[PDB]
Design a protein around this ligand. Structure first.
Ligand code: BCL
Ligand code: BCL
Ligand code: BCL
Ligand code: BCL
Ligand SMILES: CC[C@H]1c2cc3[nH]c4c(c3C)C(=O)[C@H](C(=O)OC)c4c3nc(cc4[nH]c(cc(n2)[C@@H]1C)c(C(C)=O)c4C)[C@@H](C)[C@@H]3CCC(=O)OC/C=C(\C)CCC[C@H](C)CCC[C@H](C)CCCC(C)C
Ligand SMILES: CCCCCCCC/C=C\CCCCCCCC(=O)O[C@H](COC(=O)CCCCCCCCCCCCCCCCC)COP(=O)(O)OC[C@@H](O)CO
Ligand code: HEC
Ligand code: HEC
Ligand SMILES: COC(C)(C)C(=O)/C=C/C(C)=C/C=C/C(C)=C/C=C/C(C)=C/C=C/C=C(C)/C=C/C=C(/C)CC/C=C(/C)CCC=C(C)C
Ligand SMILES: COC(C)(C)C(=O)/C=C/C(C)=C/C=C/C(C)=C/C=C/C(C)=C/C=C/C=C(C)/C=C/C=C(/C)CC/C=C(/C)CCC=C(C)C
Ligand SMILES: COC(C)(C)C(=O)/C=C/C(C)=C/C=C/C(C)=C/C=C/C(C)=C/C=C/C=C(C)/C=C/C=C(\C)CC/C=C(/C)CCC=C(C)C
Ligand SMILES: COC(C)(C)C(=O)\C=C/C(C)=C/C=C/C(C)=C/C=C/C(C)=C/C=C\C=C(C)\C=C\C=C(\C)CC/C=C(/C)CCC=C(C)C
Lengths: 44, 325, 103, 256, 274, 51, 52, 51, 51, 44, 51, 51, 50
């Protein structure tokens, strides 16, 4: 029952679900940005 | 705005404070003559209190005058006793050290002989003043930090004019007694032995010289920032910590992650100032006696930067282009 | 020709030094003693003279270096040397630096 | 000597590394000497913190206090600790500001917080209290600047909360410490002290901007009108500085 | 973590901008709006230094050298590896220094203390600002700023010093240097008095302000007091920073000849006989 | 997995500030690194491409 | 004060007046400024003491 | 998706001021970056284009 | 084994922050080390391969 | 019984198990990252 | 043996940070020493092998 | 023999910290001394043997 | 003789730490001084014998 921030297990579980929604969306945009740049001028 | 405690806005003057006393009987050698200056009282204490004149103080004052007079009499005689020319060239005249051809032997009076005699009285005068600081602390039953800090300054003072010339085997290595000439010596000393910038101890002494001004700006500002909590009464804040010591500590803890105590600040203050001439004395003592060229020492030890660009002005512009023609 | 034709064909003519004067300007004489009560290295400096370049540096730098072929170089050419007597001192550096403000 | 001990490690290089060892020892000595007060670290909840820092606590040093006030060893239990603080944590974790549970200036928290110093007056070399009113002080008088006695006192909101009846001086150092304020009946009841460092003295008035007119009635008082203890000193000075943030909501809220 | 007395001071408020969005502590450090910008500018500037060090070919801290562009580039932007990186790091450094000073304002506002420290730091910032932007602006090129190297920026000082043929003769340098040697003089003696009074010989009572007040009265005949030494002490160091800023801003924008030649006004005064 | 427990020890409004600076630090730093190179400096490549 | 500052203000104004006055009759700005600085310190100092 | 909860942890009025300053400074910075180049300096292009 | 007892000695919050700073400084340093080398500098190699 | 941080014996075990899971995932990414780089330009 | 009593002398939570910093500074320095030598610099060896 | 009494005079904590620091600095110095010499520098000898 | 009375004057703690620092610095100096000489430098001598 460790909680240094006071958030319960369900409270952080639902917050972390949103965090990955932002993280994956940010990564998804980064992938398309990286994919487009590689087609433009590849670095490999 | 809020009152920044920079100038006192009201001064109170009472009976002159003659000072504390104990079984050592300080009052015997005190002058018992006091004066109050309201001009200096705006920023500091206004009482020009009595001075304890002992035998270390008198000998230092008398011998210091002899060094001052011998230098001055020589400078006056250097310009042929022309007072208008002596005043005009006051910043340029000096008592030059002996010529290098004489080594450590006594040179003629006109060729640095009076320099050694004047230096002899200056050495006695400076050491006597240090003994006064040591004796006064012992007779005041306090620590000898004033004497110990002074000894650090004397260390560079002794190295510059007494220790290094002896190690170098020539009295010519001393510093001339002039306003501009000891600046010329300072520049010539750096040029003669390579580049004194690349002396690690000169760099180290600059670190503590910069740190001393940096700390004592920080300590002065912090105390004045907490002087609304009686922070200027540091001693009472050491024996009984008030909110002045807490906020001063927490200001620097929240700024840079660590702080000091009201007593521990002066240990930082004492040691940074004391290390300025201690490292400088070592750097000067190692100059000529060991190294004789510091930039080549830097190149040998691989900390002298290397540049790849060209050096001439023709590589960057033309003479006509600079002149705009 | 390696100096007056350094960059371009500048050259030197009679007008270069005189500039319309019977005696060229910026000529110098040996004001060696300058100081009255001193001798040696103390009698060539420590006074703002015409040749000292507004400094207390030696005023005999032009005489010793540009007329007497004295050694101008003062640095030690390696990291550490044995400072044997007769080597250039800070006084020689002071005189070299005096000539060199003139440059 | 111009010979290298090994490789390119000469006497100049040897002295440099000798100073590196000394400076490292000096830094350790200086930092530990700075830890005589405030440690152990503890956390927001008040329990001792898991982390205490790379430097260990120094050995106890003893101060022989004068005027028969006993000894003092700084590394140890701190008598200046304040209990029953009126604060609550805004977060369950660490590193977050505390929210005062009542009036921050009245409870003495934050900029208004004081420290539990000794409840005795500071004494000079002679032994009598260091800070005394000029009426009690003998031979003292104004030598320069504007005399604040009799001038009205203006608060931070422009209210006139009384006039300066007397000013307390440090006769040991011949320095002005406080100004007594004879609070008007409309604002206060008796006399309140304000430190010289938080009051700006003009030609016709003395202005303190940290404290509004309504906060003078709550300024901490002194037990006696002839001396002020270190505890009363700490409470009085902290109250005025607490007004720099707690006088009105505008000061506490961000300026932009 | 906290201190034994830190809890009662960690209160909400005192920010200049951002409110409670950033108003928290990370470890002992206080993080504000300007603590966020300090972190961004300091980290970006530090990384760009090591990025420039990587392409420079050496990571040796002594030999790292991010130099300003050539004087031909003027006040415009240069290629990032032809001196342009120095311009960005300067922008990051200025942003970090100003944020650091503004962060100190929030810290001392939350503690209800004076703003002397951020003001004193602003003088140090001004001394840096007059060295990196003000003087290059007056001289018309960003190449007049000092490079960002531990030993490379000493060569700039040495060359700029000898750019006026003897830099000791700078009148403002004399005033500024006199303040450094005296600020360390004041620091040594002031630190000694408090230590001497608080640490008497073993077996003897500690001393109060009177004993140190009468010590330099017995020593040098005058004592400026406990409060006065910090007041003159801040002024001595601030004047050291200010006059150092002056001596370099007049070297080249105001004075182009040798600094010894400046003293020619005193030598050839009409009162002096020929 | 159970990485959601990272919010049991790290408070959301103190880490999001931490990553906000860090993410923009990376975004600004990497772009400047590309601008330093002569191959990925899209600003000068437009000039080179247009001749 | 209200009188020492005024006397100090009078001295610095006289120092500026002596600075430009020497430039008009020849001299130089730096030579004139020193006498102006000297006049500010001497006349201002004398006034600050002679009249209070 | 469910990003509306970001205002449950960050103060809306504090964030808006912070992001308003960030957006302008970023906009001013990028504009100055364009002005530093030759290809994307619209002020210089107009002079070059007009004879 | 019993390596989990490191958290009875070390606070999880301070260690995680410690490695987060350390690991990124690792990543930044190593990436910069390769960028110093002429062989592993992928930015210059793109220019060479483009020809 | 001994804990300077206040964590219980079972609380630390739960925290460490997730930490190792994160450690292996971070290491697994690095191994693939190193493997791709080695095929790109081997350093052995 | 009986070396376990070192923890009766040293605080475990202060030694571990001390050795954690020491071990990495050890590891970095030996890596940097190897890189300085021309024989053991694997970055230049890779460049030489590729040729 | 009877040297155990040194711990009645020296604090075990202060000496052990000093001894640990002294031993590594002594060990580092001697390793650095050998590297300076051209006969005991094992890094340069490995290159010589390989060539 | 009866030199044991020196400890009635000198604190054993302060003398022992001073002696330990003095002994190593003295020992290090003599080792360094030998390394400076051309004769007793055992590192250079081993190279010569190779
Ligand atoms: C070299 C070839 C391309 C190039 C290749 C790439 C590639 C490849 C990528 C980028 C990516 C990015 N590039 Mg780029 N990029 C180039 C030139 C540019 C230029 C320009 C003027 O030339 C610009 C402006 C950018 C800008 C950007 C950003 C859009 C983005 C990185 C985001 C970041 O660092 O901050 C983000 C950090 C933040 C934390 C800032 C947050 C600030 C705001 C105000 C915070 C508000 C939060 C508040 C609480 C409100 C919350 C609301 C939420 C929406 C719910 N690039 C060149 C032309 N660029 C990278 C990316 O990730 O894109 C997604 C990417 O993958
Ligand atoms: C071209 C010039 C050379 C140069 C050549 C030197 C030389 C030469 C020296 C220094 C030294 C110093 N240099 Mg350097 N230095 C240069 C560039 C710099 C720069 C810079 C920004 O460029 C700086 C900041 C410094 C800074 C410093 C200080 C760190 C240091 C002096 C220590 C001290 O406090 O002295 C203060 C100490 C004293 C003044 C002497 C003690 C005085 C005695 C005790 C007092 C007696 C008083 C006397 C009796 C008169 C009393 C009269 C009263 C009215 C009664 N240097 C360049 C490289 N530098 C010194 C050093 O090396 O230290 C290791 C030194 O000798
Ligand atoms: C040939 C050399 C010439 C010479 C040429 C110069 C030149 C050229 C200069 C000086 C300047 C100075 N010289 Mg000089 N000078 C010489 C001889 C000397 C001697 C001596 C004993 O011989 C001395 C004492 C001095 C003394 C000084 C001071 C007047 C001044 C030093 C800089 C300054 O004040 O700080 C001011 C600088 C700052 C306050 C730095 C600001 C720091 C910032 C705000 C914070 C830094 C944070 C940073 C990121 C670190 C953080 C990292 C970690 C997290 C902590 N000079 C010789 C003759 N001198 C320098 C000057 O005045 O600069 C203004 C100057 O440019
Ligand atoms: C030379 C050939 C390849 C190369 C080969 C490699 C190899 C091989 C590796 C990398 C690695 C990495 N490379 Mg690389 N790399 C190259 C060029 C690049 C470039 C570029 C623009 O050119 C970039 C951006 C990167 C970037 C990166 C990162 C993806 C990664 C380093 C992570 C680290 O150091 O910090 C780590 C930072 C931290 C630990 C802190 C992160 C901070 C965040 C914001 C904290 C959030 C925590 C918060 C509580 C949320 C928690 C949520 C959890 C899910 C619960 N590389 C070249 C092209 N690179 C190294 C790596 O680590 O891979 C995993 C790796 O092994
Ligand atoms: C009154 C003038 C004196 C002074 C005062 C002063 N300095 C101060 C303060 C005060 C009152 C502070 O409160 C503040 C502080 O907190 O100090 C601990 C500070 C400070 N002055 C400092 C140092 C310092 N002071 C110096 C001098 C002085 N400062 C004067 C003597 C010097 C000199 C002479 O060079 C230095 C180096 C810092 C310890 C601190 C400022 C901390 C700071 O700015 O933090 C934010 C930035 C970073 C953590 C890193 C930023 C990195 C950059 C983005 C990139 C690099 C830029 C830089 C140009 C690098 C150049 C390197 C080469 C030159 C080697
Ligand atoms: C941003 C909104 C605030 C916010 O809430 O986001 C925070 C994240 O904080 C950040 O986004 C860091 C941005 C600070 C950098 C400012 C410099 C201006 C950008 C560069 C300009 C520089 C000036 C040069 C011309 C956490 O959440
Ligand atoms: C580089 C300078 C140099 C050049 C070239 C030069 N002179 Fe001279 N000249 C001198 C110097 C030095 C003096 C001595 C100073 C003096 O007498 O005033 C001098 C003096 C003289 C004098 C004597 C002045 C007197 O006081 O009576 C004459 C005549 C003379 N020059 C003629 C010439 C002529 C004609 C030329 C052109 C060919 C010439 N000089 C070019 C350097 C030179
Ligand atoms: C036109 C360039 C010129 C100027 C201006 C100049 N130098 Fe020189 N300098 C020289 C020449 C030529 C020499 C060579 C003399 C010799 O070695 O006989 C020299 C030699 C020196 C030496 C001797 C160094 C060594 O031991 O070889 C010093 C000292 C010196 N210069 C310092 C300075 C200083 C300080 C300045 C700044 C005022 C300066 N120089 C400016 C041309 C000049
Ligand atoms: C020097 O070297 C060179 C080669 C030059 C170099 O460049 C080296 C580069 C190097 C080393 C880069 C190393 C990169 C690393 C480490 C990558 C870190 C990046 C990471 C980890 C990505 C996080 C993404 C987080 C987001 C974007 C979350 C979105 C959050 C959203 C907004 C959700 C939150 C919203 C809510 C509503 C919460 C719910 C709230 C309640 C329920 C209340
Ligand atoms: C200079 O020399 C040159 C040659 C250049 C050089 O490069 C030298 C290089 C040198 C010396 C390498 C030095 C590197 C070393 C030593 C490697 C350390 C690296 C280590 C050790 C890897 C840790 C990984 C930890 C993670 C990444 C965990 C992930 C954490 C996750 C996220 C779990 C957290 C999740 C939770 C839910 C919270 C916990 C649970 C509860 C709260 C229940
Ligand atoms: C300069 O160049 C030249 C000249 C060439 C030069 O190099 C000169 C070299 C010179 C001069 C060398 C000077 C070296 C000297 C003098 C050697 C000192 C070195 C010594 C003496 C070695 C101590 C070793 C002690 C250990 C390793 C204990 C280990 C203890 C372990 C860890 C057990 C833990 C201990 C406990 C007690 C447990 C706790 C118990 C209870 C709590 C019950
Ligand atoms: C109006 O009154 C009259 C009277 C007319 C007058 O003119 C007043 C006097 C006037 C105006 C002279 C003004 C003096 C001036 C400007 C001098 C500035 C002085 C300066 C800058 C000092 C440089 C630093 C020198 C060092 C660093 C020394 C250190 C050397 C010490 C001393 C060590 C001892 C040396 C020895 C050799 C030992 C000898 C002993 C034996 C051999 C036993």
């Amino acid at each position: 029952d460790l909680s240094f921030t006071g958030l319960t297990d369900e409270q952080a579980q639902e917050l972390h679900s949103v965090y990955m929604s932002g993280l994956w969306l940010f990564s998804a945009v980064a992938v398309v940005a990286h994919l487009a740049t590689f087609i433009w001028r590849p670095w490999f | 705005p809020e009152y920044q405690n920079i100038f006192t806005q009201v001064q109170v003057q009472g009976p002159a404070e003659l000072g504390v006393d104990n079984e050592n009987n300080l009052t015997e050698e005190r002058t018992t003559g006091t004066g109050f200056s309201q001009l200096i009282g705006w920023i500091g204490n206004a009482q020009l209190g009595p001075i304890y004149l002992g035998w270390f103080g008198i000998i230092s004052l008398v011998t210091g005058t002899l060094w001052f007079n011998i230098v001055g009499f020589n400078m006056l005689s250097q310009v042929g006793y022309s007072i208008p020319e002596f005043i005009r060239q006051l910043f340029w005249l000096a008592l030059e050290p002996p010529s290098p051809e004489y080594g450590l032997r006594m040179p003629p009076l006109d060729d640095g002989g009076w320099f050694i005699i004047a230096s002899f009285f200056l050495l006695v005068s400076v050491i006597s003043w240090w003994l006064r600081s040591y004796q006064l602390a012992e007779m005041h039953k306090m620590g000898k930090h004033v004497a110990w800090a002074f000894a650090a300054a004397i260390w560079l003072f002794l190295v510059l004019g007494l220790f290094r010339p002896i190690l170098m085997g020539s009295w010519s290595e001393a510093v001339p007694y002039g306003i501009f000439p000891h600046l010329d010596w300072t520049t010539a000393f750096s040029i003669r032995y390579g580049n004194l910038y690349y002396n690690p101890f000169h760099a180290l002494s600059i670190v503590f010289l910069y740190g001393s001004v940096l700390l004592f700006a920080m300590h002065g500002a912090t105390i004045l920032a907490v002087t609304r909590f009686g922070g200027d009464r540091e001693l009472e804040q050491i024996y009984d910590r008030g909110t002045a010591s807490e906020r001063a500590g927490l200001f620097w803890r929240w700024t840079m992650g660590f702080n000091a105590t009201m007593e521990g600040i002066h240990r930082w203050a004492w040691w940074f100032a004391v290390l300025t001439p201690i490292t400088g004395g070592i750097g000067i003592l190692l100059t000529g006696t060991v190294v004789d060229n510091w930039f080549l020492w830097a190149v040998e030890h691989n900390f002298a930067p290397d540049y790849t660009q060209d050096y001439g002005y023709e590589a960057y512009t033309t003479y006509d282009g600079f002149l705009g023609r | 020709a390696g100096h007056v034709y350094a960059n371009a064909e500048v050259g030197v003519t009679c007008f270069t030094c005189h500039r319309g004067q019977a005696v060229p300007s910026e000529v110098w004489y040996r004001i060696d003693p300058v100081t009255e009560n001193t001798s040696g290295w103390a009698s060539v400096q420590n006074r703002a003279t015409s040749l000292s370049q507004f400094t207390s540096l030696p005023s005999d730098a032009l005489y010793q270096y540009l007329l007497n072929y004295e050694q101008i170089a003062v640095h030690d050419l390696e990291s550490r040397v044995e400072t044997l007597p007769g080597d250039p001192t800070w006084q020689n550096t002071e005189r070299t630096y005096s000539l060199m403000n003139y440059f | 000597m111009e010979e290298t001990f090994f490789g390119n490690f000469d006497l100049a290089s040897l002295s440099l590394w000798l100073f590196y060892g000394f400076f490292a020892l000096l830094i350790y000595y200086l930092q530990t000497e700075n830890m005589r007060e405030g440690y152990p670290l503890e956390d927001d909840d008040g329990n001792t913190a898991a982390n205490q820092g790379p430097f260990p606590l120094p050995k106890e040093k003893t101060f022989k206090l004068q005027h028969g006030r006993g000894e003092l060893t700084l590394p140890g239990e701190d008598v200046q600790r304040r209990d029953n603080l009126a604060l609550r944590k805004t977060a369950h974790g660490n590193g977050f500001p505390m929210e005062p549970t009542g009036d921050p200036m009245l409870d003495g928290v934050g900029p208004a917080s004081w420290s539990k110093r000794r409840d005795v007056p500071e004494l000079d070399a002679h032994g009598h209290p260091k800070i005394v009113p000029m009426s009690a002080a003998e031979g003292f008088g104004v030598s320069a600047g504007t005399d604040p006695r009799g001038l009205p006192v203006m608060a931070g909101d422009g209210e006139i909360v009384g006039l300066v009846s007397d000013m307390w001086i440090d006769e040991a150092e011949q320095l002005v410490r406080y100004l007594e304020i004879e609070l008007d009946p409309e604002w206060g009841d008796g006399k309140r002290l304000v430190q010289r460092e938080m009051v700006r003295i003009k030609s016709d008035r003395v202005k303190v901007r940290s404290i509004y007119g309504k906060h003078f009635k709550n300024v901490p008082k002194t037990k006696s009108p002839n001396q002020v203890t270190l505890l009363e000193e700490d409470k009085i000075m902290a109250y005025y500085a607490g007004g720099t943030l707690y006088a009105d909501e505008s000061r506490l809220e961000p300026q932009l | 973590a906290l201190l034994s007395f830190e809890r009662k001071y960690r209160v909400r408020g005192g920010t200049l901008i951002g409110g409670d969005l950033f108003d928290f502590w990370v470890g002992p450090f206080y993080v504000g709006f300007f603590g966020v910008t300090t972190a961004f500018f300091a980290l970006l500037g530090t990384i760009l230094i090591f990025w420039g060090a990587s392409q420079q070919g050496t990571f040796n801290p002594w030999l790292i050298n991010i130099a300003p562009p050539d004087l031909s580039y003027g006040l415009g932007m240069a290629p990032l590896m032809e001196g342009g990186l120095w311009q960005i790091i300067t922008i990051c450094a200025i942003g970090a220094f100003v944020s650091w000073a503004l962060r100190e304002v929030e810290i001392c506002r939350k503690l209800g203390m004076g703003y002397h420290v951020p003001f004193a730091f602003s003088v140090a910032i001004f001394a840096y600002v007059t060295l990196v932007v003000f003087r290059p602006l007056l001289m018309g090129a960003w190449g007049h700023g000092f490079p960002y190297g531990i030993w490379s920026h000493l060569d700039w000082v040495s060359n700029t010093g000898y750019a006026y043929l003897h830099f000791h003769y700078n009148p403002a340098h004399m005033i500024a240097v006199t303040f450094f040697f005296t600020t360390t003089l004041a620091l040594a003696l002031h630190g000694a008095l408090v230590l001497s009074a608080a640490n008497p010989p073993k077996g003897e009572e500690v001393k109060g302000p009177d004993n140190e007040d009468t010590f330099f009265r017995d020593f040098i005949g005058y004592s400026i007091g406990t409060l006065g030494i910090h007041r003159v002490g801040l002024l001595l160091a601030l004047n050291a920073g200010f006059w150092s800023a002056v001596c370099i801003i007049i070297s080249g924008p105001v004075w182009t000849k040798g600094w010894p030649e400046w003293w020619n006004w005193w030598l050839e005064m009409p009162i002096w006989p020929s | 997995s159970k990485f959601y427990k990272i919010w049991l020890i790290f408070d959301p409004r103190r880490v999001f500030v931490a990553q906000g600076v860090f993410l923009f630090l990376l975004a600004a730093m990497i772009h400047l690194v590309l601008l330093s190179t002569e191959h990925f400096n899209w600003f000068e490549l437009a000039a080179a491409n247009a001749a | 004060m209200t009188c020492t500052i005024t006397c100090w203000g009078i001295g610095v104004l006289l120092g500026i007046m002596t600075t430009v006055g020497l430039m008009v009759v020849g001299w130089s700005f730096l030579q004139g400024a020193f006498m102006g600085v000297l006049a500010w310190l001497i006349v201002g100092g004398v006034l600050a003491v002679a009249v209070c």
